[PDB]
RNA sequence: UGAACAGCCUCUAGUUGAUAGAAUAAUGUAGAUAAGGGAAGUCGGCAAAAUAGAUCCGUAACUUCGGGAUAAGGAUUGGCU
RNA sequence: UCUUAAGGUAGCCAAAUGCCUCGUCAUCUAAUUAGUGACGCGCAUGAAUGGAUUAACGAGAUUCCCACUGUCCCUAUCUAC
RNA sequence: CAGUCAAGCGUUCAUAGCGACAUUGCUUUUUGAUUCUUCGAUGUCGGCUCUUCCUAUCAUACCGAAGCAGAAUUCGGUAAGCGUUGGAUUGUUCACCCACUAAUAGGGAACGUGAGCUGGGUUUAGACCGUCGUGAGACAGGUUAGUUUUACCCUACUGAUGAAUGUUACCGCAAUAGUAAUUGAACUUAGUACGAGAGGAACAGUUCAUUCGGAUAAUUGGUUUUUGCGGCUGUCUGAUCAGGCAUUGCCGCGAAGCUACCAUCCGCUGGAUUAUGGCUGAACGCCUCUAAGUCAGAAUCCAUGCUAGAACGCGGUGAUUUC
């Protein structure tokens, strides 16, 4: 097995934990918790949410 | 007339009456069969439920879809400090059932068991078993006579045990004191086994081993007074219901001119003595050992304690049992462990279980790591980390 | 399943009770389906026949082709969008929920599939994983 | 603020009265929320929820030629310069 | 072929009026004693005992659609009293 | 509802299954018949709910007979353990369909059940229309609208305490009482047996599911007064930071908590049996499951296992108070 990355925020998802959304064009999204899951259903931008690893990468910390 | 659609009885009659059971400790209503071929050892144990968790293992059954592929399934943690055997009692059978005749103790007894006997430790004259020790402080002078009496008679000898309430991280400081029917060997072997084991620690890795079909005996967590629909499973009433929708509508016809026993109705729900069967112990682990939550595939030193510890309980510095299934009882609840009553296989009882990964995620919420070294390696330094 | 069972269905937690209008996924000429029964259902008093992914069902296409509107016909759900627990501890879901028309043996009446399918219905109905684009 | 003697907050003025206190079971009365499905529940969509202002785009049948009509069905609205 | 003073003309119809009656057919729906359009010996429709028709209106009565929803599948949770 | 006789049907054969003419009966769900009771009121259809009961079996278990090659399907026997559904229209009981099903058995408890619901019906008063009547009005002829009262008592029930066995604490026993797990499908057996072919089985083993049940919250999903963090509005504290109020101001997240076949686990095995088939063996020197004896077996029954402990059934152990 292997430990994974949040499709929104970029964090290790130990299995047993999390949910997995698939879009109609078959896009596979993983979410560790309902914070990231509800924020993606609110279409929040990962480059704007200030605790995301994409925020971490876009602001170089 | 006749009931316009047939439906089941809502609820199970056999668990009537649904009262609060007697004690915080569960009674035990059966034991394994006595047989002289098995050597003299226990049939049970008393441990505590400390928290639940969920581990990753391999399924190996020839015919599933997930033969030799990954699964992850719920387990339960019972803190099992090796109990101090002191004393034993004797039962002889009659057509009036069994009857006790004798209770022998050890010489020195602990503060925990004498705080079980006391009710006001803060005001006591510490007068427990003193004339009993006066019958002791000798060789066998008023002891070996009842010992040979038990040898001469007394078909069932039960070891008395008491737990290590100082070693549990609670704040109860009062020991539980219960019994185990010895169903190994013959009777003289049982009694001198106990005579040896007077004031002696007996352990779970000595009585049990892995892949074992065990039983749990517990009084389930209390839930107060109760409505009829959640107490028994009844379909609710519509919105237009003058006087109440969480009710059972009829309670009987005209004649029987009473409320029948089976008719669902309020009462206590919860705090009930139950006994469940068919578990498998997935780890016997040691508190005097690191890497408690480490499997064969991981091999990284991590204890079974989560970061921040189990909620309402804490640390598992004792020995522990990690067993399959939803055993009843909450955290901090004394639960009585037991071996089987039947030699089933089902091609299930004998499956070799491989340990692969253990969720040590933070039960205080939804944890994102397993290890504080992992957490510091991820987030780097912080403001608090100078 | 009925007859179309090369492997049985481990319980996929129910997410489409009777009356549901689940979308049509094929090239048959239908658009959306209306669940009218469940084959292999339960029976509990004042309890709907609730189906899940891969349950062979009866359905009516409410809307489309005149020779495919307004009749009784078998169907196979391929997408649920009610999150269920696989044996290995993963809860997945969709946002669309859909099925295909089938015959009472199990081949699709339509020779295509719009969209993803599930691993469960793939293992459970082999003509789908032939006719699917992707599989998850 | 606001279209406004709407609803909300405050000034002046008057009041701070209506049995309390302790725990917060069942069932209530009043509030709300709910994942997938969407009358299948029910006699009956009762209850409840969903649309809701302003601006602009646009508007059927029928008509007593006045209406229907805010028909329907969409879009934007905050702040700062 | 008789008769009553004249013997239902324009219309409407299983209608708030139809016993049989859940009329026949069409539509509606997977499925309809409902609704809808027709047919007419219509037990017992019909002309200010007012007939028919109708825009707009209506806390009237009724069927379907769309959105909508704890009405239900199947319940659960918090608050005030 | 169930029998007796057998004219016949059943290709030939009364009884495989049926069965005319006659016949003897049995239940109270009919519907009558009666008017014994309540008219100083027994709340009144139907539905929603909920327990229990009948066997005159629809399915499940075991079997027996078939016009049983096999598949299916018909009859009969034991048993009431377990199950008997989602909808359409109808106020409906019933009906008639669409399906699901292993199967959609009959029925009861004051035509169960209204201080349990709802109020569509019927069953007042408003109003129409139709037919009759000179009118008043009449109509189980149509339709629309029409307030559904009290529990704090006693008893039952479900849970709770609780004085009296020298006191007190602990460990148990078990007299008693209820009992539950139930039902399919896939593979393989096997295109095997079997069958001219077409067709086409069952036992065992493995793997999941339906219905009930009982737990549990690790994850998931639900709930927000953690008013915990953040955002937004209007007004008030001169301004900011901070906040006051809008009967929890709204909204996103959110622990702790509680909670769903909406989450996961789990539902033990020994015996005595009935129908049924037999062994030995008479009476009845042959024979025979029967008369005496005896074997095998059901979801039965009794146990195990479970469920509270007789609060007047018991056992053991411990310590039992002085200036």
Curated annotation (Swiss-Prot), chain A:
Subcellular location: Cytoplasm
Main location: cytoplasm
GO biological process, one term: cytoplasmic translation
Gene Ontology CC annotations of this record: cytosol; cytosolic large ribosomal subunit
Keywords associated with the record: Cytoplasm, Phosphoprotein, Ribonucleoprotein, Ribosomal protein
Positions where Phosphoserine occurs in the chain: 7
GO molecular-function term, one example from the UniProt record: RNA binding
Subunit structure: Component of the large ribosomal subunit (LSU). Mature yeast ribosomes consist of a small (40S) and a large (60S) subunit. The 40S small subunit contains 1 molecule of ribosomal RNA (18S rRNA) and 33 different proteins (encoded by 57 genes). The large 60S subunit contains 3 rRNA molecules (25S, 5.8S and 5S rRNA) and 46 different proteins (encoded by 81 genes).
Function according to Swiss-Prot or TrEMBL: Component of the ribosome, a large ribonucleoprotein complex responsible for the synthesis of proteins in the cell. The small ribosomal subunit (SSU) binds messenger RNAs (mRNAs) and translates the encoded message by selecting cognate aminoacyl-transfer RNA (tRNA) molecules. The large subunit (LSU) contains the ribosomal catalytic site termed the peptidyl transferase center (PTC), which catalyzes the formation of peptide bonds, thereby polymerizing the amino acids delivered by tRNAs into a polypeptide chain.
Additional comment: Present with 247000 molecules/cell in log phase SD medium.
Protein family membership: Belongs to the eukaryotic ribosomal protein eL24 family.
Name used for this protein in its record: Large ribosomal subunit protein eL24A
Organism placement in taxonomy: Eukaryota, Fungi, Dikarya, Ascomycota, Saccharomycotina
Gene for this chain: RPL24A
UniProtKB/Swiss-Prot annotation, chain B:
Main location as per UniProt: cytoplasm
GO biological process: cytoplasmic translation; maintenance of translational fidelity; ribosomal large subunit assembly; rRNA processing; translation; translational elongation
PTM notes: Methylation at His-242 by HPM1 is required for proper 60S subunit assembly and promotes translational elongation fidelity.
Subcellular location: Cytoplasm
Superkingdom of source: Eukaryota
Record keywords, A-Z: Cytoplasm, Isopeptide bond, Methylation, Phosphoprotein, Ribonucleoprotein, Ribosomal protein, Ubl conjugation
Observed effect of gene inactivation: A mutant confers resistance to trichodermin, a trichotecene toxin produced by plant-pathogenic fungi.
Cross-link entry Glycyl lysine isopeptide (Lys-Gly) (interchain with G-Cter in ubiquitin), positions: 38, 135
Keyword Glycoprotein: no
Modified sites of kind Pros-methylhistidine: 242
Modified residues (Phosphoserine): 23, 155, 296
Example of a GO cellular component annotation carried by this entry: cytosol
Modified residues (Phosphothreonine): 102
GO molecular function: RNA binding; structural constituent of ribosome
Pfam families linked to this entry: Ribosomal_L3
Xref: PROSITE patterns: RIBOSOMAL_L3 (PS00474)
Record flagged with keyword NADP: no
Further facts: Present with 450 molecules/cell in log phase SD medium.
Family: Belongs to the universal ribosomal protein uL3 family.
Role: Component of the ribosome, a large ribonucleoprotein complex responsible for the synthesis of proteins in the cell. The small ribosomal subunit (SSU) binds messenger RNAs (mRNAs) and translates the encoded message by selecting cognate aminoacyl-transfer RNA (tRNA) molecules. The large subunit (LSU) contains the ribosomal catalytic site termed the peptidyl transferase center (PTC), which catalyzes the formation of peptide bonds, thereby polymerizing the amino acids delivered by tRNAs into a polypeptide chain.
Name by which UniProt lists this protein: Large ribosomal subunit protein uL3
Species: Saccharomyces cerevisiae (strain ATCC 204508 / S288c) (Baker's yeast)
Lineage: Eukaryota, Fungi, Dikarya, Ascomycota, Saccharomycotina
Record gene name: RPL3
Swiss-Prot record, chain C:
Cited Gene3D superfamilies: Ribosomal protein L14
Keyword field contains Ribosomal protein: yes
PTM section of the record: Methylated by RKM1 at 2 different sites, but it is unclear which are the 2 methylated residues among Lys-39, Lys-105 and/or Lys-109.
Family matches, as Pfam families: Ribosomal_L14
Entry protein name: Large ribosomal subunit protein uL14A
Signal sequence, renumbered to the chain: none
Subcellular localization, as worded in the UniProt entry: Cytoplasm
């Amino acid at each position: 097995m292997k430990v994974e990355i949040d499709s929104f925020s970029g964090a290790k998802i130990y299995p047993g934990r999390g949910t997995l959304f698939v879009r109609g064009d078959s896009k596979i999204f993983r979410f560790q918790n309902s914070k990231s899951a509800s924020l993606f259903k609110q279409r929040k931008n990962p480059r704007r949410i200030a605790w995301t690893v994409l925020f971490r990468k876009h602001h170089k910390k | 007339s006749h009931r316009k659609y047939e439906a089941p009885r809502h609820g199970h009659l056999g668990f009537l009456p649904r009262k609060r059971a007697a004690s915080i400790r569960a009674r035990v209503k059966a034991f394994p069969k006595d047989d002289r071929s098995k050597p003299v050892a226990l049939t049970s144990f008393l441990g505590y439920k400390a928290g639940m968790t969920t581990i990753v293992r391999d399924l190996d059954r020839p015919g599933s879809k997930f033969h030799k592929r990954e699964v992850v399934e719920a387990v339960t943690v019972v803190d099992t400090p090796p109990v101090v055997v002191v004393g034993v009692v004797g039962y002889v059978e009659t057509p009036r059932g069994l009857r006790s005749l004798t209770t022998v103790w050890a010489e020195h007894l602990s503060d925990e068991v004498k705080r079980r006997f006391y009710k006001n430790w803060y005001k006591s004259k510490k007068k427990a078993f003193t004339k009993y020790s006066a019958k002791y402080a000798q060789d066998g002078a008023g002891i070996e006579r009842e010992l040979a009496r038990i040898k001469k008679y007394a078909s069932v000898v039960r070891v008395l045990v008491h737990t290590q309430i100082r070693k549990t991280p609670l704040a109860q400081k009062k020991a539980h004191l219960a019994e185990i029917q010895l169903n190994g060997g013959s009777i003289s072997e049982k009694v001198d086994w106990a005579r040896e084991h007077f004031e002696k620690t007996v352990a779970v890795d000595s009585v049990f081993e892995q892949n074992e079909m065990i039983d749990a005996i517990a009084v389930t967590k209390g839930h107060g007074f109760e409505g009829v629909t959640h107490r028994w499973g009844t379909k609710k009433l519509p919105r237009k219901t003058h006087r109440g929708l969480r009710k059972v509508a009829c309670i009987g016809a005209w004649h029987p001119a009473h409320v029948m026993w089976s008719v669902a109705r309020a009462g206590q729900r919860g705090y009930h003595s139950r006994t469940s069967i068919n578990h498998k112990i997935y780890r016997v682990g040691k508190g005097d050992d690191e890497a408690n939550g480490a499997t064969s595939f991981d091999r990284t030193k991590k204890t079974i304690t989560p970061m921040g510890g189990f909620v309402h309980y804490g640390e598992i510095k004792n020995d522990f049992i990690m067993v399959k299934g939803c055993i009843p009882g909450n955290r901090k609840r004394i639960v009585t462990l037991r071996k089987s009553l039947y030699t089933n296989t089902s091609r299930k009882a004998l499956e070799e279980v491989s340990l692969k990964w253990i969720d040590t995620a933070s039960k205080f919420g939804k944890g994102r790591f397993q290890t504080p070294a992992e957490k510091h390696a991820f987030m780097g330094t912080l403001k608090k980390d100078l | 399943s009925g007859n179309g069972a090369q492997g049985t269905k481990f319980r996929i937690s129910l997410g489409l009770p009777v009356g549901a209008i689940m979308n049509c996924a094929d090239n048959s000429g239908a658009r959306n389906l209306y669940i009218i029964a469940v084959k292999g259902s339960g029976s509990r008093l004042n309890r709907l026949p609730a189906a899940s992914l891969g349950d062979m069902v009866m359905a009516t296409v409410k809307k489309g082709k005149p020779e495919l509107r307004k009749k009784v016909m078998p169907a196979i759900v391929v997408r649920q969008a009610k999150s269920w627990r696989r044996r290995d501890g993963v809860f997945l879901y969709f946002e669309d929920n859909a099925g295909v028309i089938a015959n009472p043996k199990g081949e699709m009446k339509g020779s295509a599939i719009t969209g993803p399918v599930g691993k469960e219905c793939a293992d459970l109905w082999p003509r789908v994983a032939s006719n699917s684009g992707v599989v998850v």
